[PDB]
Design a binder for this molecule. Structure first.
Ligand SMILES: Nc1nc2c(ncn2[C@H]2CC[C@@H](COP(=O)(O)OP(=O)(O)OP(=O)(O)O)O2)c(=O)[nH]1
Ligand SMILES: [Mg+2]
Length: 639
DNA sequence: TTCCAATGACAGCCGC
DNA sequence: GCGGCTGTCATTG
């Protein structure tokens, strides 16, 4: 039967618990947060409403050890056990000694690591296991796990423990979710037991699938690096953002006024119906869809489709980038600057990492606005700044997905091109626009990039037609030419589809599996979609494995040369100038670090060396390093 | 439904 | 009238 042992109710029970805890190689913890320096627990960063009041420990069966973190006010607190004494014994059991294998199981490890550091001043220092990450590893296309879905799939006999605990069907940890009428003590105790027992079953399934080395050496260390990134945040200049906003808003106003004069009346730029009425019924243009590709053709015939396209581009930068950044920015009183603290998301189809609240990966590339015939550069990335005196360092793998595709297809032509040829997207753009490499603008090089990856990942003549502005038959010939030039690639496509049809899955370089049962489907679309996912998952998933390994290996190196704090949070949670490199953003083939002036040479060497050594392929993994006063103004830096 | 992956606002519809 | 669902359309890699 379910029991909660209140270890802080008696000095003698406490020491017996501490002695037993110090013997464990494996245990679960769950933090207890409730709604309201205080006597009744630790304030949480961002919420004036909720407290960490305790945590629960489990190391087997249906026994939860509830460890209170309240000064005053289950049996009561033994007053000889001061909060300072409890905090000592807590930090002691949660930090590694020398040559001591210890694993802690935490549902939503990242969120718990941060609350323990920032709220309680405790830095977890053991091997971590998150059953959310184990679920992902067993089926990456599964829905995001909840405590309820984990217990349903892996511990179904304990579903009754979750009866009347409706927040177990939300994403957030049951212990962390103070939006319940159940006590933090009960919620954390139930979670501790469900997660410890669930993780035993998830460990057995990882072992059967041969994914346990991936889980311990790549995925959970990757989660630890993402915890440091989320504690670091990324520096943000509200002033740079506002001045860009005002230029963009002035251009939106002039576009609206000119659109409405051409239309003859007001219309909503957000209503496809209104735009269709104006373009096709009122202006009688040739066609009813109002997509990017339609308006891109029609801008050659009338000014209004071009205005529509620019309206959507600029409205996007204002409503989906400026508004959320201004809303989410947060004063860091130590660094003396504003930062943004995005949330990492590792539950993805191919093992990429993305961000939410807000998704900083989607900050526009540089673009141009013309007003009264004067051009203004809008560089939204220029609003992302290092701490005063610091630099932004970006290190990007050159053509990582192409290098992996060369390696797996042994294509001798693609290997030559990458080894000593110029930019392949420039070669494509040059041949296409009847020019030499040098004239290519950013927007044209991106068009060529879309063409090259598009063709490789199974894009058809109809779509290539629209992108290249040529007839299907002309696009179809261009695909044949491309496929003929790189015959190794085409053999690897057919060999990957054959092997997927047989097995029901594809595998990345590290052994992660994606299940594609659409591959057997009789429906031509679903079959072809699965075949395209089969090819793309192997290459894109492999690239995401290499970047994770790089990230983990850089973090180990930074912490050896680490006289000083592993994140900005390790200074917050502490309560001597800034030294070292701070992981601030991942961009799929590119890592951004914020680096102290004195450390930029050494951190640049470490980052480049570790990214180039991540794995050994048939081809060299080339890395370009850039450095600058903002994400928007990065300059080449020879390392 | 015919490049893949991702987040996320927003019309418009409908069952409740 | 409200909330969920489902495309549309944006941007990034
Ligand atoms: N299928 C597909 N993959 C893409 C597309 N754009 C980018 N990717 C993938 C493959 C390359 C990888 C990194 O994106 P980048 O824009 O950096 O591509 P890159 O080849 O490194 O280019 P660059 O040299 O400009 O950094 O993301 C696209 O349009 N389609
Ligand atoms: Mg790149």
């Amino acid at each position: 039967s379910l029991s909660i042992i209140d270890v802080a109710s008696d000095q003698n029970l406490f020491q017996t618990f501490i002695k037993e805890w110090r013997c464990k190689k494996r245990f679960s913890i769950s933090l207890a947060c409730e709604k309201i320096i205080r006597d009744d627990g630790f304030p949480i960063k961002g919420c004036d409403d909720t407290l960490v009041v305790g945590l629960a420990v489990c190391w087997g069966g249906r026994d939860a050890y509830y460890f209170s973190l309240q000064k005053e006010q289950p049996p009561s607190l033994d007053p000889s056990l001061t909060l300072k004494d409890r905090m000592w014994y807590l930090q002691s059991c949660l930090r590694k000694e020398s040559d001591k294998e210890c694993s802690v199981v935490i549902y939503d490890f990242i969120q718990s690591y941060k609350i323990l550091l920032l709220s309680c001043g405790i830095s977890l220092e053991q091997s971590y296991e998150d059953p959310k990450v184990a679920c992902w590893l067993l089926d990456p296309d599964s829905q995001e796990p909840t405590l309820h879905s984990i217990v349903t799939s892996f511990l179904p006999h304990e579903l009754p423990l979750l009866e009347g605990m409706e927040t177990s069907q939300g994403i957030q940890s049951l212990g962390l979710n103070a939006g319940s009428e159940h006590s933090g003590r009960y919620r954390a105790s139930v979670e501790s037991i469900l997660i410890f027992n669930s993780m035993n079953q998830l460990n057995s399934l990882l072992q059967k699938e041969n994914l346990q080395d991936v889980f311990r050496k790549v995925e959970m260390p990757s989660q630890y690096c993402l915890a440091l990134l989320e504690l670091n945040g990324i520096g943000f200049s509200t002033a740079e953002c506002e001045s860009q906003k005002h230029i963009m808003q002035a251009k939106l106003d002039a576009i609206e006024t000119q659109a409405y004069q051409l239309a003859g009346h007001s219309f909503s730029f957000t209503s496809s119906d209104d735009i269709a009425e104006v373009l096709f019924l009122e202006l009688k243009l040739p066609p009813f869809s109002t997509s990017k590709d339609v308006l891109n053709k029609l801008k050659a015939l009338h000014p209004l489709p071009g205005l529509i396209l620019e309206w959507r581009r600029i409205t996007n930068a204002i409503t989906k980038v400026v508004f959320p950044l201004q809303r989410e920015k947060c004063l860091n009183p130590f660094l003396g600057m504003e930062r943004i603290y995005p949330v990492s998301q590792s539950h993805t189809a191919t093992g990429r990492i993305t961000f939410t609240e807000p998704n900083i990966q989607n900050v526009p590339r540089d673009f141009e606005i013309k007003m009264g015939g004067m051009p203004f550069s809008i560089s939204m990335r220029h609003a992302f700044v290092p701490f005063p005196g610091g630099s932004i360092l970006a290190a990007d793998y050159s053509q990582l997905e192409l290098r992996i595709l060369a390696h797996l297809s042994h294509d001798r032509r693609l290997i030559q091109v990458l080894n000593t040829g110029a930019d392949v997207f420039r070669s494509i753009a040059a041949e296409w626009k009847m020019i030499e490499p040098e004239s290519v603008g950013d927007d044209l090089r991106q068009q060529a990039k879309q063409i090259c990856y598009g063709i490789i990942y199974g894009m058809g003549a109809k779509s290539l037609g629209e992108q290249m502005g040529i007839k299907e038959n002309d696009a179809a010939c261009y695909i044949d030419s491309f496929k003929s030039r790189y015959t190794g690639i085409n053999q690897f496509m057919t060999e990957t589809v054959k092997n997927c049809k047989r097995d029901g899955f594809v595998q990345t370089i590290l052994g992660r599996r994606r299940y594609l049962p659409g591959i057997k489907d009789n429906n031509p679309y679903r079959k072809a979609h699965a075949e395209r996912q089969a090819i793309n998952t192997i290459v894109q998933g492999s690239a995401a494995d290499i970047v994770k390994i790089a990230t983990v290996n850089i973090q180990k190196q930074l912490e050896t040369f680490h006289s000083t704090f592993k994140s900005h949070g390790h200074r917050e949670g502490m309560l001597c100038p800034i030294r070292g490199g701070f992981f601030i953003l991942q961009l799929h083939d590119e890592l951004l670090y914020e680096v102290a002036e004195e450390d930029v040479v050494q951190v640049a060497q470490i980052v480049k060396n570790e990214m180039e050594s991540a794995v050994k392929l048939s081809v060299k993994l080339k890395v370009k390093v850039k450095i600058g006063a903002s994400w928007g103004e990065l300059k080449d830096f020879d390392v």
